[PDB]
Structures are given as C-alpha cells and as structure tokens.
Design a protein around this ligand. Structure first.
Ligand SMILES: [Cl-]
Ligand SMILES: [Cl-]
Lengths: 106, 106, 105, 105
C-alpha cells in the first residue's frame, strides 16, 4: 500500500496500511520539525548528515522513554507492596488488640 | 416507669422506659450469670459481698473495654496516616520520574 | 499472688483478694463505684443500690463492646475497599505493560 | 564539553559532537540504528533508508509516550480510589467515636 511522503525536501515512499496512515502523517510531521530544529541549532545544511544525527537523537530518546516506563513500573510495584503492607499491619493490629485477654480481681 | 426484676434471689425495682427494656432484661441476665459464676469460683455465699465484688469486677472490665476502644482508635489514626503517606509518595514519585529532562547528542 | 485488700465502698468495709499488679486498678474501680453509688443515691438500701449500679455498668459495657464491634465491621469494609484498589492496580499494570507495539514497515 | 566522535553507521562515516558522559549512550544508539538499518534493508539508497528508520522510531517513541500517559491516567484513578477510602475511614471514626452512651436511671 505505497504512500508517498515529503520530508525536509525529500520524497519518500513507505508501505503503510490506512489504519496507520494518521500515525505515518504524524511521524512525517515530527521528523520534519526535528530536522528543521536540528538544522537551526547546529547550522549544518547537509541533509544526509542531518537525518543521521536526527535518527541517532531519536533512538536515544526512545531508549530514554523506555527507561521512564521501566522506572514508573518499578516504582508502582513498590507502592503496591507498601499498600499491601499497610493492609497486613491493619489486620495484625486488629488481632493484637481484639485478642487482648480480660482481667478480673476475683 | 417502674420495672420489677429478679436477680440472684433479690427483688429489684428500676425506672426504665420501654425502649430500654430489652437492654434491662439483658443486663439482669448478665448480672445473674456473673454472680452465679463468682459464687462458684470463690465459694462465697453472702449475697451482698458477691454483688460488691461483681460490681468492682465489672467496673474494671468497663475501664478495660474503654482502653481497647482508645487503643483501636489510636492504631487506626496511624494506619490512616500511613495510607496518606503512601499517596503522597505516589505523587512525589510520579513527579520525580515525569519531570525527568530528556537528553540529546546535538 | 493474690492478697486480701480492705476497701471502703459507700460506708461498707469490703475485703477483696487482689494481686499487687492490679492494686492500682482496684483503687480505680473502688473510686468509680463509690462515685456511681453516690450519684445514684442522689438520683434515687446499700445492697440494692449496688445491684442497680452493677446493672448500669453492665449496660455501659455492652454499649462499649458494640463500639468495638462497629469499628471492626467498618474496617472490614475499608480493607475490602483497599484490597480492591490493589487488585485493580495490578491488573492495570499488566494491561498496559503488555500491549504489543506497531511499526509501519 | 562536547567533542567530535567518529561513528560508522551502515557503511557511512559520521561525525557527531558528544560529551563523554553520553559516549556509551551514543555507542548504544549507533548499535540500535545499525541493526534497524540492516533489518530494514532486508525487509525492503542509504539516506532514504535512514529517513524510513527515523519514521519508525518516531512512531515507536509516540507509542512509548502513550504508555507513560496511560499509566499516569490509570494511577490518577487509583489515587482517587485510595483518597475516597481515607475520607470514609475518617468519617466512620467520627461517627462511631461520637455516639452518646445511655443509662437506665
Ligand atoms: Cl450508675
Ligand atoms: Cl525500523
């Protein structure tokens, strides 16, 4: 299903089903913007060099996002365990107090 | 509203509205049983002495129950604070991870 | 080891066997019963007065026990509510963590 | 302080300015991009191949961000659920702790 795209003055063709077309348009728009911003802050105007550097940057950004995902998950596991421990403490306390043996004088 | 009761061979009269009558019957039954059990384990058969000792025992039992109530409450306040602290930690963590600044090469 | 303790309760000398570890509690019970008997006499035979005071304390103790029961029942619900939150968090983690990625080509 | 680093990416020598604290990340990015470009060439001009690889990574990064968002949304609900449990516990404590006692007489 060949889709023709224009990114940073370059003609690309990519096979893409219609269900992914909006995502493809968004990615084309993202990569266009990335290359424009990279060109601005580095003054490089060679396109092939720009796209290599952009691809390395975005690769690193994906690794960084996956770490954020992993870190959020690791933190949530701990929070859940902490919650479960407060339930266990609630039951232990309830037991400790409720089983208190009564006293009498005689 | 005079109610005539029989407890441990003694005739009592107590003013008691109808809305409290079941509670009065239950209390009469409780004090009857208490005096019978006290007589069994102490061998005392003087009624006035038994009822004095029973009243002291039950006074102490009420103080003991009120302590249980106070203790349960003190424990629950702590458990609630512990729960609230896990919520606060959840928000702090979320913030810590989510505000992580991204890196790029160039 | 229980030793006899002489108490004064509402005009009446009373001997009670009590271990020293409970002596303070005994004094406190004697003080509580003395105050109850005095108040009762004003509101209303010593022996009959003590039966009536013991009935009142019985009812108060029943009421205090109902408070214990009602705290416990209430907390059973709270724990069920927290456990449901934990079970959902775990489920959501699995649902999100397991989604397959897509690519174009 | 960024220094130029010579890399080899899919047959192409490339100079990238990178601070030493990010050198390992750069090597890892180069390895990831090299593997992507190879796989892509098998599935499917170097420059065009790199545009396509960058499109794929863009989409994957968008998808990874949606996971972050979806975890956050899910947790907002979980926190609301816990806060509701806390508010109820406090309310119940007050309700029970404040009940007036009764007596007979
Ligand atoms: Cl009373
Ligand atoms: Cl790819």
């Amino acid at each position: 299903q060949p889709v023709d795209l224009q990114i940073f003055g370059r003609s690309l063709r990519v096979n893409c089903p219609p269900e992914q077309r909006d995502a493809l348009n968004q990615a084309a728009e993202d990569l266009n913007q990335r290359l424009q911003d990279l060109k601005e802050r580095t003054r490089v105007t060679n396109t092939e060099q720009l796209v290599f550097i952009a691809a390395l940057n975005i690769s690193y950004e994906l690794t960084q996002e996956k770490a954020k995902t992993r870190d959020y998950a690791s933190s949530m596991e701990q929070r859940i365990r902490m919650l479960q421990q407060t339930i266990e403490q609630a039951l232990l306390e309830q037991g400790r107090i409720s089983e208190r043996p009564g006293s009498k004088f005689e």
